Amino acid sequence: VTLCSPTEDDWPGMFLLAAASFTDFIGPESATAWRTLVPTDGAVVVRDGSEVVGMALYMDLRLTVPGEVVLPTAGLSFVAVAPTHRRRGLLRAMCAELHRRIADSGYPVAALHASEGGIYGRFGYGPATTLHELTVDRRFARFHADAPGGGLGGSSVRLVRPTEHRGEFEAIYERWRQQVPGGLLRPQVLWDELLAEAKAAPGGDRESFALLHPDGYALYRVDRTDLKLARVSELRAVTADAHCALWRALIGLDSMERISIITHPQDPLPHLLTDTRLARTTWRQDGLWLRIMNVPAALEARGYAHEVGEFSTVLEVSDGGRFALKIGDGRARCTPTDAAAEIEMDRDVLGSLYLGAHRASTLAAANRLRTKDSQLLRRLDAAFASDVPVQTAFEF
Template identity: 35%
Template sequence: MTIDLRPPAAGDWDEFVLRLERAFGEPAMTSEERAMWRDFLPLEQALTARADGGIVGTAGAFDFRMTVPGGTLLDVAGVTMVSVQPTHRRRGVLTAMMRRQLDDFRERGLAVAVLLASEPSIYGRFGYGTATRQLHGRIDTTRVTVQAPPGADAVRLRLVTPAEGVAACEAVYARAVPGRPGMLARQPEWERLALLDPPADRGGFGARLCVLAEVDGEVRGYARYSVKAGGTALGVPDGTVKLKDLEALDPVTYAALWRYLTDVDLVARLVFHNRPADDPVQQIVSDIRRCNFSWRDGLYVRLVDLPAALAARAYAAPLDVVLDVEDPFCPWNTGRWRLSGDAKGAVCERTGDPADLALAARELGTAYLGGHGLRALAGAGLVTELRPGALAEASAAFRSDLEPWVPHGF
């Protein structure tokens, strides 16, 4: 089968979206959603795979700036809208699109690509490693309370619409971004994503609300959420609060917001589906067993330009290690690399010196943001120690003080 890869023309957008929806079996986007994603995605950074007279595959890439360990904002490609029509699976369409994308990213000088996988098994063969985790929870608010620190009662909470609060929320979010690896700086117009709330997608929940948390007149945090009313046959309130997102600049404001969310009238539970794996909510609830916490994979990371990517981040401990890297899909990364760095920065260069660790590019992607230790990967047989002590040195250096996390989908 001949596959023709090319960016969609301006008139192809509706068909591009239709093919994407069909591949995922999803209902049609609203006109507002279609317009928003079209505004976000430059068509020259999208791909259509054409065969047998039509579009059989789609892919795109957003321009993001992502925090890496040390606080630097790194330009990255956010891979998105990847689909293959069910009639053309296992015929090389996805491989062709991944090949073209990674070549394009390299030509543009991007060191890292990231994505959120619809299925975990798909992208490892292209060198993407699972780099972050998401915390999910279902808190029984009839039995669980939040233990707020002193000062929480002085936090003023103000309920507004998401549109009314968007500027204040964006200011808080921008201050939080440098503090945690994996967070994405808000690109122009992307605040619209948090305001998107189509009635057809609410699943019985009401319109989204926004609560602002103020201290001495300054907004120090926010939460956006929705509520579904409900009751038992005996008239006992049985509603649900669904948290969309929450950010706070200090522990007191943070606890005040969680206390508010778990104390909404006429509800019996609070649910959320994407918080950092180490979110402090786990420490302030009165009964962790009634919170039904679980974790799942989050962001996948691919090193496109290995030396540039490894030199762009800082390291938690001094290291000087030679990595023997295997990367068949991006062969320019294959070989031995000396990585030397510390908390102030790093250098990564080709070397002929004997290797200390051997691993594949996928495992470097998994470890890149500091959420998964190289020692754990070695325990799974995915990293081989060639010099005694090198694994402990590198594993400690790669780790992040905070678990990496991406706060929203794309």
């Protein structure tokens, strides 16, 4: 039982572990298209002797952080251990090895989508974003008088087939993912897989449809079993007008009873209607997890709030070291130090705070970050707060 990099002979064996560990595994076909994003020396395997019984890999992704700064991010995926080799310490060996490779490759941050909220708590990964499923009873849904595009006249939204307007979607998404914190770059290979999942599979999902705006798009599909529910798989909108214009079209679906969308907590849809409660939050869960690899490099690259007063403090990470942090006028200075620490927090506590979805005061009451200065807490709350609402791009 040892650890090494995989070969071409290992890939048929890696699909077998994937299909048995992941129920939503996209088959042996699509995993090759996802492989084009995995860099060389970006995957680890464990053999027994010998059959492959452990695997874990990261992808080269581009995550947008607050202040429209794009960071190279290691996207952890395909992390699976055979049921016959658990409790031994294969995950502990694989994840510790990959982080060593991620740190050598020069990645400031590492990210993943968790299957459970307890596996990746100690590994330094913290829930950085929040998924927020909204379900709208569209039969009662009526827009507020203040909602944009209230008058009569040719609406700027069109009902189009998703595969026939690909070039337009790639352009809109690119404009979205650069200005919205949490946005990820979608390469050519990922549009290939997303657009192939739009056509109706025999015995699977229904045919997807698209609503097209010059500054946004809605990618929806009717549920296979619930023929009265339209499930919006994707909603990208650049302008505030584009968001409202796409929803007037979505509630326009007179064939449907309900419209469901997995979105972000600060979605302005509830206020867009007369009855705010008609946009019910049916489901809430953490989305994208973050592990800050390079502490000073990640904190400096992020954009902060201009509203907060200029302050300086010494921050301590569990086993990441001790860092001096200077925040003022939107930008931050971060350099390694050894002066007396004011705030003490674990590696995963910084992960949650980074994108600004979780307040430090909330984590302080939970005693996840410790400080004797209560005024410093109020300043970290304001400084880490993102100007543009945090969103989850896509699952990987």
